[PDB]
């Protein structure tokens, strides 16, 4: 009895994983526009916070390469809402 039910459960998991796979292309597209929208907002504000600093190139990279580098949590959520950040960083780990 235990083996048939377990075997049935492996097939259910595949049907669950495939449904995820059919959706990932849409979620990837949404995630891209969401990050780029937030990187610009951080860039736009920095222009108004470092408008007077003499030795400052706005939006300058820190890497020598021009490749795309995925932004870390500090960059992406630079000055977002305090509770927005907390759920962005510890939202999953603390959700029980």
């Amino acid at each position: 009895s235990m083996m048939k039910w377990n075997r049935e459960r492996r097939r259910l998991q595949i049907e669950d994983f495939e449904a995820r796979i059919a959706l990932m292309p849409l979620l990837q597209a949404e995630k891209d526009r969401r990050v780029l929208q937030m990187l610009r907002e951080n860039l736009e504000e920095e222009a108004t916070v470092m408008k007077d600093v003499p030795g400052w190139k706005v939006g300058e990279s820190v890497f020598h390469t021009t490749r795309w580098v995925t932004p870390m949590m500090g960059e992406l959520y630079g000055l977002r809402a305090s509770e927005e950040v907390l759920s962005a960083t510890y939202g999953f780990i603390w959700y029980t």
């Binding site: 907002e41 916070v49 470092m50 870390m72 000055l79």
Partner: protein
């Protein structure tokens, strides 16, 4: 290795875990996969003495992706400037950042 037996016998005992760009379960990439790949491909074969000078860029970029020091300093400067301007009623928070 002092005795490179693994190369002689062609058996991988621990080289599968030496670098973080090696093959991982379920093809899970590390955060700094791309940078570690380039440094290793830049510095293959030329030897350590040369790679200390000719592949210096690819290693500084990698060292940035690991500890992110040059990045946190930049953020640190902006935060310092911002809290100064917002201290004397000169910085107006943008809407999304707060509201």
């Amino acid at each position: 290795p002092f005795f490179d037996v693994q190369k002689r016998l062609g058996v991988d005992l621990d080289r599968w875990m030496t670098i973080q760009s090696a093959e991982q379960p379920h093809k899970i990439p590390s955060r700094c996969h791309a940078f570690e790949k380039e440094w290793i491909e830049c510095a293959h074969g030329i030897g350590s003495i040369r790679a200390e000078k000719e592949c210096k860029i690819e290693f500084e970029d990698f060292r940035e992706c690991l500890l992110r020091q040059k990045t946190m300093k930049r953020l640190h400067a902006i935060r310092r400037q911002r809290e100064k301007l917002i201290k004397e009623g000169k910085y107006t928070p943008p809407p999304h950042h707060s509201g």
